[PDB]
Amino acid sequence: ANEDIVISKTSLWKEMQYNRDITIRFKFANTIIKSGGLGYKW
C-alpha cells in the first residue's frame, strides 16, 4: 500500500432532508415449479 493522490480541489456540498409521499404497488409472484416423475412432485 502506502500511496494516495488527490483527484480534484474542494467542492461545496450541503445536507438536506427530502420529505415525499410514496405509494407502493408491488404484486407478488410464484415460481411453482414442477419436478420430475409422474407430476406429483414439486
Next chain:
Amino acid sequence: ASLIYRQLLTNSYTVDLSDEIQEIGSTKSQNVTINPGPFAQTGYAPVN
C-alpha cells in the same frame, strides 16, 4: 513654442479612441463570484 503644451492638452480626447483600439485587441476574460463565509462543518454520519 508653448503651442506644443497647449495642443497636447487640448487634443486629449483622442486618448479614449486609442484606448478603445487597444481594448478591442485585448483578450477578454470573466470571473465568477466566490462563495465566501465560515462554511459549516459537516462530517460523516455515525455508522457501524
